[PDB]
Amino acid sequence: ESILEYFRPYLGRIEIMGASRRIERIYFEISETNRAQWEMPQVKESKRQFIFDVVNEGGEAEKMELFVSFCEDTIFEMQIAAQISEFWGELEVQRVKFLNYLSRNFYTLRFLALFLAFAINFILLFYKVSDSPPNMVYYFLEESTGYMEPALWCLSLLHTLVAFLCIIGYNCLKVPLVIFKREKELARKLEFDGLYITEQPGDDDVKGQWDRLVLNTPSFPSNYWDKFVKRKVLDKHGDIFGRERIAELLGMDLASLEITAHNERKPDPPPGLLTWLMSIDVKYQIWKFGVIFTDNSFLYLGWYMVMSLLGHYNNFFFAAHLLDIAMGVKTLRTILSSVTHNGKQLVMTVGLLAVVVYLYTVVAFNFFRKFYNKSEDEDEPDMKCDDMMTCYLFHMYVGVRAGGGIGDEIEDPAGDEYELYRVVFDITFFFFVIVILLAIIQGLIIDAFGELRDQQEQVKEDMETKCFICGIGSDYFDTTPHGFETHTLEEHNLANYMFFLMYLINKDETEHTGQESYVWKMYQERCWDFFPAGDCFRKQYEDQLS
Amino acid sequence: VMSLLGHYNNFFFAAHLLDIAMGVKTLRTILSSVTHNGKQLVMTVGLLAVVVYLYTVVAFNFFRKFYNKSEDEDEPDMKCDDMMTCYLFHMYVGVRAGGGIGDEIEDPAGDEYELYRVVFDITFFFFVIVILLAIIQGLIIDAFGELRDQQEQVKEDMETKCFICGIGSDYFDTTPHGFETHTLEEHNLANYMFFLMYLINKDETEHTGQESYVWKMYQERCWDFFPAGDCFRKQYEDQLS
Ligand SMILES: Nc1ncnc2c1ncn2[C@@H]1O[C@H](COP(=O)(O)OP(=O)(O)OP(=O)(O)O)[C@@H](O)[C@H]1O
Ligand SMILES: Nc1ncnc2c1ncn2[C@@H]1O[C@H](COP(=O)(O)OP(=O)(O)OP(=O)(O)O)[C@@H](O)[C@H]1O
Numbered sequence: 186e187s188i189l190e191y192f193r194p195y196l197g198r199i200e201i202m203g204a205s206r207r208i209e210r211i212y213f214e215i216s217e218t219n220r221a222q223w224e225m226p227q228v229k230e231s232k233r234q235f236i237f238d239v240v241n242e243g244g245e246a247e248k249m250e251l252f253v254s255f256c257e258d259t260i261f262e263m264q265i266a267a268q269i270s271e272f273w274g275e276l277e278v279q280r281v282k283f284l285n286y287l288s289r290n291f292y293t294l295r296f297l298a299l300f301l302a303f304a305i306n307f308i309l310l311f312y313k314v315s316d317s318p319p320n321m322v323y324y325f326l327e328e329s330t331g332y333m334e335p336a337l338w339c340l341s342l343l344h345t346l347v348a349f350l351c352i353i354g355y356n357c358l359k360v361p362l363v364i365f366k367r368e369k370e371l372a373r374k375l376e377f378d379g380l381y382i383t384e385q386p387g388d389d390d391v392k393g394q395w396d397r398l399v400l401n402t403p404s405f406p407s408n409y410w411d412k413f414v415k416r417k418v419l420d421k422h423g424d425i426f427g428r429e430r431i432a433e434l435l436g437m438d439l440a441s442l443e444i445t446a447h448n449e450r451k452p453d454p455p456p457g458l459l460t461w462l463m464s465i466d467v468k469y470q471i472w473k474f475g476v477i478f479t480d481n482s483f484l485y486l487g488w489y490m491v492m493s494l495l496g497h498y499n500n501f502f503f504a505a506h507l508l509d510i511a512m513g514v515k516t517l518r519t520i521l522s523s524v525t526h527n528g529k530q531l532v533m534t535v536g537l538l539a540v541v542v543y544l545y546t547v548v549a550f551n552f553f554r555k556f557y558n559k560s561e562d563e564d565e566p567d568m569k570c571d572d573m574m575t576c577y578l579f580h581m582y583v584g585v586r587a588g589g590g591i592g593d594e595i596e597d598p599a600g601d602e603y604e605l606y607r608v609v610f611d612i613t614f615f616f617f618v619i620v621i622l623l624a625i626i627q628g629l630i631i632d633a634f635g636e637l638r639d640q641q642e643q644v645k646e647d648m649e650t651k652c653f654i655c656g657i658g659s660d661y662f663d664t665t666p667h668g669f670e671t672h673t674l675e676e677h678n679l680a681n682y683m684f685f686l687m688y689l690i691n692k693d694e695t696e697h698t699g700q701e702s703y704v705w706k707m708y709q710e711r712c713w714d715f716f717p718a719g720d721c722f723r724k725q726y727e728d729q730l731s
Numbered sequence: 732v733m734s735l736l737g738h739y740n741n742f743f744f745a746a747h748l749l750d751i752a753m754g755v756k757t758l759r760t761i762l763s764s765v766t767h768n769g770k771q772l773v774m775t776v777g778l779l780a781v782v783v784y785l786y787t788v789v790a791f792n793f794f795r796k797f798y799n800k801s802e803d804e805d806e807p808d809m810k811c812d813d814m815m816t817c818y819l820f821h822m823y824v825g826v827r828a829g830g831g832i833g834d835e836i837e838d839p840a841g842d843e844y845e846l847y848r849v850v851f852d853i854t855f856f857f858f859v860i861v862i863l864l865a866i867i868q869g870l871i872i873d874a875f876g877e878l879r880d881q882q883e884q885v886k887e888d889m890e891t892k893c894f895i896c897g898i899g900s901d902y903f904d905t906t907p908h909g910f911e912t913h914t915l916e917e918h919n920l921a922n923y924m925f926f927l928m929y930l931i932n933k934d935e936t937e938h939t940g941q942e943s944y945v946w947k948m949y950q951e952r953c954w955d956f957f958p959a960g961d962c963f964r965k966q967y968e969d970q971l972s
């Protein structure tokens with residue numbers, strides 16, 4: 186009992202759909218370092234997000250494929266974590282320590298920048314205007330103590346410094362993950378689909394049209410676990426393209442690859458930085474700069490940097506940094522996610538509002554225009570519907586923002602030939618423009634709240650009543666006491682499958698057992714059959730009570 | 732403390748009308764839906780403060796000449812001459828106004844910034860008033876709906892699943908009144924509690940084998956005697972129990 190209790194965290198068990206269509210239980214070793222890297226909070230958040238997006242998108246046939254992609258991405262993620270864990274050579278070692286510190290404390294720098302923005306705007310909250318020096322107007326910071334102006338300048342400089350550190354930390358932390366995903370997806374399209382060979386990417390996929398650059402670059406498979414993907418694609422498409430067009434397209438030399446594969450020698454680089462200076466791959470660096478430039482988060486950080494520089498230009502440009510709380514706190518993320526949900530609906534219904542307001546505008550211009558006086562000075566009439574521009578502007582602004590119909594502001598239609606027509610006009614304007622359309626906007630956002638809550642509840646229910654791996658309903662396991670909990674914690678566990686991946690990658694191919702080699706060969710051939718679907722060990726040997 | 736301060740001044744007794752919220756259960760449910768999504772409510776009024784501050788800095792830098800807020804021409808009452816008064820004026824008047832802040836601001840007609848002021852007022856009315864206040868209202872309405880969903884779910888779970896074993900209702904309802912009989916006689920919460928009382932009351936020497944077995948797991952805190960996914964009916968279904 187004591188041995189099992191001690192080795193229980195390191196013992197991992199899974200169930201695979203093995204040979205002869207039989208569910209087989211596989212037992213293996215889980216490294217303590219791998220387990221700790223998995224229990225790190227960032228990996229937990231990534232797993233939660235992956236489960237949420239899988240359940241929300243509803244992928245069923247591709248669920249195992251998305252699980253494989255998540256496992257590969259997160260293994261590369263803790264590879265990054267292990268790298269960032271804890272003269273010219275001294276310059277390089279201090280540089281890598283500095284980037285290490287930034288990558289470790291990226292989130293703390295983000296919170297520090299947000300707090301600095303709060304402090305800067307709190308200082309700006311005492312800005313005062315006086316025409317006289319402290320026609321043309323002076324903007325001066327009024328404060329009795331007088332300490333907040335040097336504080337403002339120092340805080341501006343420190344905020345820009347911390348924001349630059351945020352860009353550097355993002356580049357050292359999240360950029361490699363994005364590059365790894367792009368290289369992996371490009372390799373999948375190149376090999377398992379032939380996206381550029383015996384097929385052509387369409388003009389719609391600008392991502393493919395830009396990924397065309399790294400086809401011929403010698404550093405194509407960098408930042409990616411597979412470095413022989415080019416050779417594999419060459420091997421499977423040489424019979425179709427004569428191997429010479431493949432060599433030209435993917436940028437190898439057949440003789441060079443043969444003479445390096447049979448036997449290779451190792452050169453020595455000089456310690457000077459010049460060899461790196463002309464050994465940088467220009468095309469691959471251009472492609473990487475392009476993809477990380479179109480990456481959304483890096484765009485947000487670049488916008489933050491431009492905003493900070495314009496904050497140095499004028500201090501009030503720092504007020505735009507209070508929108509950072511929306512991306513920072515997750516509660517604003519959910520609330521503004523419900524706001525942005527049905528966003529096409531929102532913008533196109535305010536367009537419908539514009540259209541119906543234009544119809545009311547043309548009606549009011551053709552007749553009822555005498556009521557649009559909008560003037561108290563009798564000698565100087567201020568006709569607001571004397572032309573379509575001013576009438577449409579007046580309607581779309583005043584009548585829309587008014588608490589009721591446009592007749593609230595329009596001169597009262599009493600004792601007129603068009604009295605009933607004006608009454609009908611005002612009632613229809615109030616009932617459609619205000620009562621219906623604004624309530625449509627409000628109902629859209631409220632229903633977006635309800636729909637997002639429904640998504641969260643559905644994800645929780647699916648995770649509670651169905652196993653992620655096999656998909657067997659919970660009641661069959663709950664027939665046995667705590668059966669579903671035991672099944673989802675020991676037999677089929679996402680962490681256990683990931684740790685099997687880590688164990689297979691770590692150990693040598695000569696030490697693989699038959700089951701491990703079988704799983705490894707389907708993992709190399711991208712055939713997700715070993716994942717049990719609709720079958721577990723319990724129903725495999727239910728007659729024998731397992 | 733409120734009663735003692737009521738002796739100090741009689742008007743401190745007015746705080747005791749909040750006792751009805753804790754007293755009657757209907758106010759408990761209504762104010763429970765109010766307090767539900769309370770972090771949401773307070774942090775969205777914080778978001779309202781942030782966006783109002785953005786509109787405040789925009790209005791301070793330009794459009795500030797329209798914030799006269801004075802009828803006496805000799806004594807201007809500029810409400811956006813500084814960030815304090817501009818932010819206060821926005822966050823109070825413009826938020827509480829029935830529409831945009833342009834309802835109270837001087838009308839932007841015949842000005843170089845006419846279109847800019849129009850866009851400013853439209854955006855203020857559409858985001859500050861139309862969106863955010865409706866977010867608050869939708870939060871409380873969805874809290875009502877979510878609490879009603881909780882009550883309906885509790886009732887449904889109690890109606891279709893036995894509390895003890897968890898077997899679905901349809902298996903018992905195969906027999907007429909089967910679920911009612913099962914939840915009233917075979918597995919009953921009151922019956923299990925009364926077994927607890929009986930075991931505690933009677934002496935340990937008078938315990939039968941089954942009672943000693945249940946008693947020893949109750950002392951060792953092993954809840955295995957509670958049937959889970961199994962009842963007498965499916966235990967002897969072949970023999971018709
Ligand atoms: N094959 C499976 N592997 C793992 N979890 C599964 C599987 N099938 C279903 N589940 C469910 O996934 C849920 C995961 O939620 P849980 O909070 O336990 O995860 P966690 O990663 O330990 O959490 P956290 O990140 O909050 O520490 C479990 O409650 C379990 O019922
Ligand atoms: N094992 C169980 N023991 C008791 N009740 C169960 C069990 N399984 C399910 N139930 C359900 O619990 C419900 C309890 O509701 P009910 O109103 O009958 O209870 P009560 O305590 O008698 O009510 P009240 O407090 O209103 O007098 C029953 O309708 C029954 O269907």
Ligand SMILES: Cn1c(=O)c2c(ncn2C)n(C)c1=O
Nearest residue numbers: 256257260261410690708709
């Ligand atoms: C499939 N696969 C991976 O997914 C992988 C890997 N090395 C790292 N990763 C992530 N190897 C060698 C591998 O064959």
Ligand SMILES: [Ca+2]
Nearest residue numbers: 695696697698
């Ligand atoms: Ca072997």
Ligand SMILES: [Ca+2]
Nearest residue numbers: 936937938939
């Ligand atoms: Ca006995």
Ligand SMILES: [Zn+2]
Nearest residue numbers: 652654655677
């Ligand atoms: Zn399973």
Ligand SMILES: [Zn+2]
Nearest residue numbers: 893895896918
């Ligand atoms: Zn039961």
